[PDB]
């Protein structure tokens, strides 16, 4: 017959292979493809949808208070409101996002980010903010004069109640790794900080404790590779009624 | 199906084979090829770069004194300065060279050699040398009259501070083996000797102990085949922190 | 100029992930209990027993895939040790709710119409392709509603989403020593068309029958706090200090 010989790698079940295998039910006629809305051909379509950041990931922020950021009328000048840990791959305010839960299925990532900060004060509430993106290397900037040297945007609470803070892709490498080292050059992303540009100025009948909802999406240049299992889920035992699937 | 039969040689892992194997990460997008300077497509490009000979491989030559050869003003006539063991494959002054460390990954070699002797005296230092290449068969020639019968070049310390002693490829065989027999017809290469053509003549303010740095390269006709492991490296235990790659 | 081909849902979900695992005994079952596996086990084929493939397939509402079932059988010995046997296994595919066998040597294993696969331990693993067998045009991964017309039906469990039963037995008879035969099933979904992406599940799973939630006792992945806490909103945890 045909003279063959088995290579190394014969009879090994590699889980991520791509091979035609023996059909159990022959001449099976599958159900015809009815047009269902919202098909996803590519997981980056899930990533590019903006989703809420949990910037208020503190104690005494129980449940839904973690999504919003309570900014107030400040009697001082140019104060810090919040800063955002930008590690998409690691734990932090970007972990429970569409850009973050899907990227923790991967190790290496590219592309820009897209923060939208939605202001949820009254219509009479007027003020301004500055949204500084600081590329990494140094400490998290605490005064406003330190951080406006980076990539900032100055945002009014006038007709504008939202923004698009494009976090630009600034990295030496093509991609960015995940490690347990958050301070690596290959892992660290930068720092988004937010300062009172002017103040939050409300009248006597508007609530002073106005809230910011922060979104994050991806851009069209976003990319993910080197797929890995999600650390966001994991079981130590079998689930309930998993025996009942056998019994 | 297809009638096959396993040949002898089935299921054996030959280390130097050439077979397409199962990719672990499917639809992987590798990092795009950025143009990095100095690509080596062929290890003979590494070999043809000239590199220093350790002709002064003696005792009381500690460290960097082994690269240079201290020639001096000689009151006698036509004296011997140094001779070079020409076994590329074996231990000697050519072992720690680019022509020698890469060739000890191989067994059979061809092609010419290219010795450059760089003189490192003063500008006021004037003299002449003769660089005799003696093809093998006989003893290492000790007097000058014996060795100028071979392939010599006569070199001034005038405007010339370097040479190109082309050791010609003279062998009966196409290639030359490595053995533990240094005196085989298939292994021995010849002898490069160096004599005072005239003298080293320096003034009262130039240092008399002038130094020669000797290079060796390969030519375009150089060749290497029958690859083997390097005897220049070897471990008897595991290295340090090799367990830490597992732990 | 970066390739986006690894985030394809055909590449995302087509990992042959562990979906079933039973170490069942292989011995004289003349004196064993009724609950224990008497050299066979049924398994209602679901994507939900193992939380890593489940959370990937629960990213979407509707999935249309072809399950490529790979059955990895491995064997161990329950005082003295002797050689491992080359046991032949049958893995008969029974549909949802149809007659599953009650014995090892029952006459349901004759497979007059059911799809079986007769494989050995020393062979490569038995890889079959079970097609897209939903009566609908996609598997309702989450099924908001009830199956029965009465009000006693199970919530979330559409039987159209259910693949079927994978009745796996050892074709050999009992041998005078007892073996522990662990059968690991690896389902690789393929030809995947995915619809309506969903929030990824953050809280740990409780049961495979539903989407109940408890959360961890503390952050991260707790009920009141999914993301792990920090000091203040203006406190950077992984701050560079030089």
């Amino acid at each position: 017959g045909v003279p063959t010989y088995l290579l190394p790698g014969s009879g090994q079940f590699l889980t991520t292979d791509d091979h035609s295998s023996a059909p159990a039910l022959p001449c099976f006629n599958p159900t015809p493809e009815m047009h269902i809305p919202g098909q996803v051909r590519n997981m980056l379509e899930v990533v590019q949808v903006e989703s809420m950041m949990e910037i208020n990931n503190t104690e005494s922020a129980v449940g839904m208070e973690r999504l919003k950021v309570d900014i107030s009328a400040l009697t001082d000048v140019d104060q810090l409101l919040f800063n955002i840990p930008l590690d998409i791959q690691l734990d932090g305010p970007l972990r429970n996002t569409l850009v973050g839960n899907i990227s923790r299925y991967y190790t290496h990532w590219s592309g820009s980010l897209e923060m939208t900060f939605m202001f949820c004060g009254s219509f009479m509430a007027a003020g301004k903010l500055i949204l500084c993106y600081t590329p990494p290397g140094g400490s998290c900037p605490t005064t406003r004069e330190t951080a406006m040297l980076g990539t900032h945007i100055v945002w009014d609470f006038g007709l504008q109640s939202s923004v698009t803070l494009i976090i630009p892709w600034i990295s030496g490498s093509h991609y960015r790794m995940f490690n347990n080292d958050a301070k690596s050059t290959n892992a660290n992303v930068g720092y988004v900080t937010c300062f009172m540009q002017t103040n939050l100025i409300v009248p006597s009948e508007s609530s002073d404790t106005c809230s910011l909802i922060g979104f994050i999406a991806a851009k069209d240049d976003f990319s993910l590779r080197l797929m890995r299992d999600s650390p966001d889920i994991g079981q130590l035992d079998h689930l309930h009624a998993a025996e009942a699937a056998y019994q | 199906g297809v009638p096959t039969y396993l040949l002898p040689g089935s299921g054996q892992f030959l280390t130097t084979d050439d077979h397409s194997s199962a990719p672990a990460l499917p639809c992987f997008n590798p990092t795009p090829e950025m143009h990095i300077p100095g690509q080596v497509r062929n290890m003979l490009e590494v070999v043809q770069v000239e590199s220093m000979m350790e002709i002064n491989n003696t005792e009381s030559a500690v460290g960097m004194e082994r690269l240079k050869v201290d020639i001096s003003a000689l009151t006698d006539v036509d004296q011997l300065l140094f001779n070079i063991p020409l076994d590329i494959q074996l231990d000697g002054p050519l072992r720690n060279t680019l022509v020698g460390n890469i060739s000890r990954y191989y067994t059979h070699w061809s092609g010419s050699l290219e010795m450059t002797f760089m003189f490192c005296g003063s500008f006021m230092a004037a003299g002449k040398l003769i660089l005799c290449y003696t093809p093998p068969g006989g003893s290492c020639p000790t007097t000058r009259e014996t060795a100028m019968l071979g392939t010599h070049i006569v070199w001034d310390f005038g405007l010339q501070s370097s040479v190109t002693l082309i050791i010609p490829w003279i062998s009966g065989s196409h290639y030359r083996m490595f053995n533990n027999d240094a005196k085989s017809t298939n292994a021995n290469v010849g002898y490069v000797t160096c004599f005072m053509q005239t003298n080293l003549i320096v003034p009262s303010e130039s240092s008399d102990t002038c130094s020669l740095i000797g290079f060796i390269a390969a030519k375009d006709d150089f060749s290497l085949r029958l690859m083997r492991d390097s005897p220049d490296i070897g471990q008897l235990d595991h290295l340090h922190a090799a367990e830490a790659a597992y732990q | 100029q970066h390739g986006v081909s690894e985030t394809l849902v055909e590449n995302f979900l087509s990992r042959a992930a562990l979906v079933s695992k039973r170490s069942f005994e292989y011995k004289d079952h003349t004196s064993s209990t009724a609950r224990a596996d008497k050299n066979f086990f049924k398994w209602t084929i679901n994507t939900r027993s193992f939380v890593q493939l489940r959370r990937k397939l629960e990213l979407f509402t509707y999935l249309r895939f072809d399950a490529e079932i790979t059955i990895l059988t491995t064997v161990a010995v329950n005082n003295t040790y002797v050689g491992l046997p080359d046991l032949t296994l049958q893995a008969m595919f029974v549909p949802t709710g149809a007659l599953t066998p009650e014995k090892q040597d029952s006459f349901h294993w004759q497979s007059g119409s059911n799809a079986s696969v007769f494989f050995k331990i020393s062979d490569p693993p038995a890889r079959i392709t079970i097609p897209f067998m939903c009566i609908n045009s996609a598997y309702s991964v989450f099924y908001d509603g009830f199956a029965g017309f009465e009000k006693n039906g199970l919530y979330g469990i559409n039987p159209a989403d259910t693949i079927g039963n994978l009745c796996v037995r050892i074709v050999n008879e009992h041998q005078p020593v007892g073996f522990t035969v662990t059968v690991r099933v690896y389902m690789k979904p393929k030809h995947i068309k995915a619809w309506a992406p969903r929030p990824p599940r953050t809280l740990p799973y409780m049961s495979i029958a539903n989407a109940n939630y408890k959360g961890k006792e503390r952050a991260p992945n707790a009920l009141s706090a999914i993301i792990g806490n920090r000091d203040s909103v203006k406190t950077m945890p992984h701050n560079i200090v030089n």
């Binding site: 091979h19 035609s20 059909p23 022959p26 | 639809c27 | 081909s5 055909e10």
Partner: peptide
């Protein structure tokens, strides 16, 4: 990979062409 020697169209490899 174009190897599908089965008579069923679903028995092919994972159609990762996009």
């Amino acid at each position: 990979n174009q190897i599908n020697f089965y008579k069923d169209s679903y028995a092919a490899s994972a159609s990762k062409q996009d």
